[PDB]
Short mmCIF file of N, CA and C in Angstrom, two decimals:
data_model
loop_
_atom_site.label_atom_id
_atom_site.label_comp_id
_atom_site.label_asym_id
_atom_site.label_seq_id
_atom_site.Cartn_x
_atom_site.Cartn_y
_atom_site.Cartn_z
N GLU A 114 12.51 -1.75 -41.74
CA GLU A 114 13.29 -3.01 -41.92
C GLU A 114 14.32 -3.14 -40.72
N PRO A 115 14.73 -4.48 -40.42
CA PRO A 115 15.68 -4.67 -39.39
C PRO A 115 16.94 -3.81 -39.57
N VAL A 116 17.55 -3.27 -38.32
CA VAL A 116 18.64 -2.56 -38.18
C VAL A 116 19.73 -3.33 -37.33
N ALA A 117 20.99 -3.55 -37.89
CA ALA A 117 22.00 -4.18 -37.18
C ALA A 117 23.26 -3.82 -37.93
N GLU A 118 24.47 -4.43 -37.50
CA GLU A 118 25.60 -4.12 -38.07
C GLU A 118 25.76 -4.69 -39.67
N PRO A 119 26.52 -4.04 -40.41
CA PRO A 119 26.55 -4.34 -41.81
C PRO A 119 26.90 -5.91 -42.03
N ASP A 120 26.34 -6.47 -43.03
CA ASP A 120 26.60 -7.92 -43.33
C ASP A 120 25.89 -8.15 -44.68
N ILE A 121 26.02 -9.38 -45.06
CA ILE A 121 25.43 -9.83 -46.40
C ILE A 121 23.93 -10.02 -46.05
N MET A 122 23.17 -9.47 -46.98
CA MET A 122 21.63 -9.68 -47.02
C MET A 122 21.11 -9.41 -48.40
N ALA A 123 20.09 -10.18 -48.78
CA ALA A 123 19.43 -10.10 -50.15
C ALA A 123 18.12 -10.63 -49.94
N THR A 124 17.05 -9.79 -50.00
CA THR A 124 15.70 -10.26 -49.92
C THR A 124 15.42 -11.15 -51.16
N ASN A 125 14.60 -12.19 -50.89
CA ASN A 125 14.19 -13.14 -52.03
C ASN A 125 13.02 -13.83 -51.47
N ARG A 126 12.14 -14.19 -52.43
CA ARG A 126 10.83 -14.97 -52.26
C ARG A 126 10.91 -16.22 -52.91
N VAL A 127 10.62 -17.32 -52.29
CA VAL A 127 10.69 -18.63 -52.88
C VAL A 127 9.42 -19.27 -52.65
N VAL A 128 8.71 -19.86 -53.76
CA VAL A 128 7.44 -20.48 -53.59
C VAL A 128 7.56 -21.87 -54.44
N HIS A 129 6.99 -22.91 -53.70
CA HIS A 129 7.14 -24.28 -54.39
C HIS A 129 5.89 -24.99 -53.87
N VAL A 130 5.46 -25.98 -54.70
CA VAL A 130 4.39 -26.92 -54.46
C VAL A 130 4.50 -28.07 -55.18
N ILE A 131 3.99 -29.27 -54.60
CA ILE A 131 4.19 -30.52 -55.27
C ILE A 131 2.98 -30.62 -56.18
N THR A 132 3.34 -30.98 -57.53
CA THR A 132 2.35 -31.11 -58.57
C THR A 132 2.79 -32.07 -59.68
N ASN A 133 1.92 -32.56 -60.49
CA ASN A 133 2.17 -33.41 -61.54
C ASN A 133 1.76 -32.77 -62.77
N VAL A 134 2.47 -33.13 -63.95
CA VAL A 134 2.15 -32.60 -65.29
C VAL A 134 0.78 -32.94 -65.68
N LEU A 135 -0.03 -31.95 -66.13
CA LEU A 135 -1.32 -32.27 -66.52
C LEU A 135 -1.48 -33.20 -67.64
N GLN A 136 -0.56 -33.01 -68.62
CA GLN A 136 -0.61 -33.97 -69.75
C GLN A 136 0.56 -33.90 -70.61
N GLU B 237 -16.69 -29.52 -94.71
CA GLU B 237 -17.56 -30.38 -94.03
C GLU B 237 -19.01 -30.41 -94.66
N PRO B 238 -19.84 -31.46 -94.49
CA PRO B 238 -21.06 -31.57 -95.11
C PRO B 238 -21.99 -30.42 -94.61
N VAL B 239 -22.89 -29.99 -95.31
CA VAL B 239 -23.77 -28.85 -95.04
C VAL B 239 -25.24 -29.40 -95.28
N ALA B 240 -26.08 -29.23 -94.30
CA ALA B 240 -27.46 -29.79 -94.38
C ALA B 240 -28.19 -29.11 -93.24
N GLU B 241 -29.51 -29.54 -93.07
CA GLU B 241 -30.29 -29.00 -91.98
C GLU B 241 -29.91 -29.50 -90.61
N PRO B 242 -29.99 -28.89 -89.51
CA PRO B 242 -29.56 -29.27 -88.24
C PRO B 242 -30.12 -30.65 -87.91
N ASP B 243 -29.34 -31.42 -87.22
CA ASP B 243 -29.81 -32.80 -86.81
C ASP B 243 -28.70 -33.28 -85.79
N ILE B 244 -28.95 -34.52 -85.51
CA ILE B 244 -27.96 -35.17 -84.52
C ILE B 244 -26.61 -35.36 -85.21
N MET B 245 -25.56 -34.88 -84.48
CA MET B 245 -24.13 -34.91 -84.96
C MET B 245 -23.36 -36.15 -84.29
N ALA B 246 -22.66 -36.90 -85.08
CA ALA B 246 -22.01 -38.01 -84.51
C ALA B 246 -20.76 -37.50 -83.69
N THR B 247 -20.61 -38.19 -82.66
CA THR B 247 -19.49 -37.90 -81.69
C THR B 247 -18.16 -37.91 -82.46
N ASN B 248 -17.17 -37.07 -82.10
CA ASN B 248 -15.86 -36.97 -82.76
C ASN B 248 -14.83 -37.06 -81.75
N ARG B 249 -13.79 -37.78 -81.86
CA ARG B 249 -12.83 -37.89 -80.94
C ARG B 249 -11.97 -36.43 -80.69
N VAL B 250 -11.53 -36.13 -79.54
CA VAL B 250 -10.90 -34.89 -79.10
C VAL B 250 -9.50 -35.31 -78.60
N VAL B 251 -8.58 -34.60 -79.11
CA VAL B 251 -7.24 -34.78 -78.81
C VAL B 251 -6.64 -33.59 -78.11
N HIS B 252 -6.05 -33.79 -76.84
CA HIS B 252 -5.57 -32.74 -76.02
C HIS B 252 -4.20 -32.24 -76.63
N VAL B 253 -3.82 -31.05 -76.11
CA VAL B 253 -2.70 -30.38 -76.56
C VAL B 253 -1.70 -30.34 -75.34
N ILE B 254 -0.57 -30.65 -75.50
CA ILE B 254 0.37 -30.63 -74.41
C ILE B 254 0.81 -29.12 -74.05
N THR B 255 0.71 -28.86 -72.76
CA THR B 255 1.01 -27.44 -72.27
C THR B 255 1.58 -27.58 -70.99
N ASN B 256 2.26 -26.46 -70.48
CA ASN B 256 2.90 -26.39 -69.25
C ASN B 256 1.89 -26.44 -68.11
N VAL B 257 2.18 -27.07 -67.01
CA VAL B 257 1.16 -27.24 -65.96
C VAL B 257 1.15 -25.89 -65.30
N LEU B 258 -0.07 -25.52 -65.01
CA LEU B 258 -0.45 -24.12 -64.30
C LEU B 258 0.21 -24.27 -62.90
N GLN B 259 0.03 -25.33 -62.16
CA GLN B 259 0.59 -25.34 -60.83
C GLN B 259 2.11 -25.54 -60.87
N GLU C 9 -11.99 -30.72 -93.67
CA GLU C 9 -11.44 -29.52 -93.34
C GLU C 9 -10.18 -29.15 -94.10
N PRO C 10 -9.90 -28.03 -94.25
CA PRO C 10 -8.71 -27.48 -95.09
C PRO C 10 -7.40 -28.06 -94.57
N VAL C 11 -7.28 -28.27 -93.28
CA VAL C 11 -6.08 -28.78 -92.58
C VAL C 11 -6.48 -30.02 -91.78
N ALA C 12 -5.90 -31.12 -91.99
CA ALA C 12 -6.13 -32.38 -91.32
C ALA C 12 -5.89 -32.28 -89.80
N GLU C 13 -6.77 -32.85 -89.01
CA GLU C 13 -6.56 -32.83 -87.59
C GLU C 13 -5.30 -33.42 -87.07
N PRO C 14 -4.65 -32.86 -85.96
CA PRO C 14 -3.34 -33.47 -85.51
C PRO C 14 -3.59 -34.98 -85.27
N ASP C 15 -2.53 -35.83 -85.44
CA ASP C 15 -2.69 -37.23 -85.12
C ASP C 15 -2.61 -37.41 -83.66
N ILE C 16 -3.19 -38.59 -83.13
CA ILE C 16 -3.28 -38.89 -81.81
C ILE C 16 -1.87 -39.17 -81.30
N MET C 17 -1.51 -38.46 -80.14
CA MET C 17 -0.21 -38.65 -79.54
C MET C 17 -0.40 -39.07 -78.17
N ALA C 18 0.40 -40.03 -77.79
CA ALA C 18 0.35 -40.63 -76.36
C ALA C 18 1.22 -39.82 -75.47
N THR C 19 0.61 -39.48 -74.24
CA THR C 19 1.33 -38.65 -73.27
C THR C 19 2.63 -39.43 -72.83
N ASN C 20 3.67 -38.66 -72.55
CA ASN C 20 4.89 -39.21 -72.05
C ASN C 20 5.31 -38.79 -70.67
N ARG C 21 5.49 -39.62 -69.81
CA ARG C 21 5.78 -39.20 -68.49
C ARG C 21 7.09 -38.47 -68.31
N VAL C 22 7.15 -37.55 -67.25
CA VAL C 22 8.31 -36.72 -67.13
C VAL C 22 8.85 -37.09 -65.68
N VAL C 23 10.11 -37.18 -65.62
CA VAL C 23 10.82 -37.46 -64.28
C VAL C 23 11.38 -36.20 -63.73
N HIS C 24 10.96 -36.00 -62.47
CA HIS C 24 11.42 -34.75 -61.70
C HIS C 24 12.84 -34.81 -61.51
N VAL C 25 13.43 -33.71 -61.31
CA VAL C 25 14.96 -33.55 -60.99
C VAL C 25 15.05 -32.99 -59.56
N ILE C 26 15.85 -33.57 -58.80
CA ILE C 26 16.20 -33.13 -57.41
C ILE C 26 16.91 -31.93 -57.39
N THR C 27 16.54 -30.86 -56.70
CA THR C 27 17.17 -29.59 -56.63
C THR C 27 17.14 -29.17 -55.17
N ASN C 28 18.07 -28.26 -54.79
CA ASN C 28 18.05 -27.67 -53.43
C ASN C 28 17.13 -26.53 -53.29
N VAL C 29 16.29 -26.56 -52.29
CA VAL C 29 15.28 -25.59 -52.02
C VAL C 29 15.49 -25.03 -50.66
N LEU C 30 15.49 -23.82 -50.50
CA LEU C 30 15.64 -23.18 -49.12
C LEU C 30 14.42 -23.41 -48.23
N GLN C 31 13.30 -23.47 -48.78
CA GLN C 31 11.99 -23.79 -48.07
C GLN C 31 11.72 -25.21 -47.92
N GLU D 105 5.86 1.89 -40.57
CA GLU D 105 6.78 1.41 -41.59
C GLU D 105 5.75 1.04 -42.88
N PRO D 106 6.36 1.11 -44.06
CA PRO D 106 5.60 0.69 -45.29
C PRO D 106 5.15 -0.76 -45.14
N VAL D 107 3.96 -1.03 -45.71
CA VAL D 107 3.36 -2.43 -45.68
C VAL D 107 4.09 -3.30 -46.59
N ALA D 108 4.58 -4.44 -46.03
CA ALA D 108 5.32 -5.40 -46.81
C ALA D 108 4.55 -5.75 -48.21
N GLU D 109 5.23 -5.69 -49.26
CA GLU D 109 4.72 -5.98 -50.61
C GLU D 109 4.40 -7.60 -50.62
N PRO D 110 3.32 -7.87 -51.38
CA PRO D 110 2.72 -9.33 -51.55
C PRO D 110 3.83 -10.15 -52.25
N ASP D 111 3.38 -11.52 -52.43
CA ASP D 111 4.18 -12.42 -53.22
C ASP D 111 4.54 -12.00 -54.61
N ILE D 112 5.75 -12.09 -55.13
CA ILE D 112 6.09 -11.71 -56.43
C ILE D 112 5.30 -12.57 -57.48
N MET D 113 4.60 -11.95 -58.40
CA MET D 113 3.82 -12.66 -59.36
C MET D 113 4.85 -13.47 -60.32
N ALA D 114 4.39 -14.73 -60.60
CA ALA D 114 5.08 -15.67 -61.47
C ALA D 114 4.46 -15.71 -62.82
N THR D 115 4.90 -14.97 -63.75
CA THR D 115 4.42 -15.00 -65.12
C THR D 115 4.47 -16.44 -65.82
N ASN D 116 3.39 -16.87 -66.41
CA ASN D 116 3.34 -18.17 -67.04
C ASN D 116 2.76 -17.98 -68.44
N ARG D 117 3.11 -18.86 -69.35
CA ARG D 117 2.65 -18.94 -70.79
C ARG D 117 1.69 -20.06 -70.91
N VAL D 118 0.55 -19.76 -71.47
CA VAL D 118 -0.45 -20.80 -71.77
C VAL D 118 -0.77 -20.91 -73.21
N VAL D 119 -0.72 -22.06 -73.78
CA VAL D 119 -0.93 -22.36 -75.22
C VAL D 119 -2.07 -23.24 -75.29
N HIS D 120 -3.10 -22.88 -76.23
CA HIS D 120 -4.20 -23.77 -76.48
C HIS D 120 -4.71 -23.59 -77.86
N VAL D 121 -5.52 -24.54 -78.26
CA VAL D 121 -5.99 -24.47 -79.63
C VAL D 121 -7.55 -24.58 -79.62
N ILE D 122 -8.25 -23.57 -80.24
CA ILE D 122 -9.72 -23.47 -80.19
C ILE D 122 -10.33 -24.70 -80.86
N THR D 123 -11.32 -25.28 -80.20
CA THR D 123 -11.98 -26.47 -80.57
C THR D 123 -13.36 -26.38 -80.14
N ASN D 124 -14.21 -27.47 -80.62
CA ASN D 124 -15.61 -27.40 -80.24
C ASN D 124 -15.80 -27.54 -78.67
N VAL D 125 -16.76 -26.73 -78.18
CA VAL D 125 -17.06 -26.67 -76.82
C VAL D 125 -17.62 -28.13 -76.40
N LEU D 126 -16.97 -28.54 -75.20
CA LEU D 126 -17.44 -29.89 -74.69
C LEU D 126 -18.78 -29.79 -74.33
N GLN D 127 -19.34 -28.82 -73.72
CA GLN D 127 -20.66 -28.68 -73.26
C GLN D 127 -21.69 -28.65 -74.42
#
């Protein structure tokens, strides 16, 4: 993982896609 | 339901069920 | 059948809600 | 370094009612 001076960090995964309700 | 020998079956309407979209 | 089939229900449109997305 | 983990799985709930096969 990246190394640097201490700071605020929080790993997160975001996934989105355009879609419509099936019914 | 009626019981008899196999033969042509009249088409019956089908109603969908509301459910969360997979996408 | 022992239980009557569900009555026909018309699909209802759903309006999307605007939200902040990082991506 | 360790291999990056894949995208986090998004659990979903599916509800359906058994009915006559369309085919």
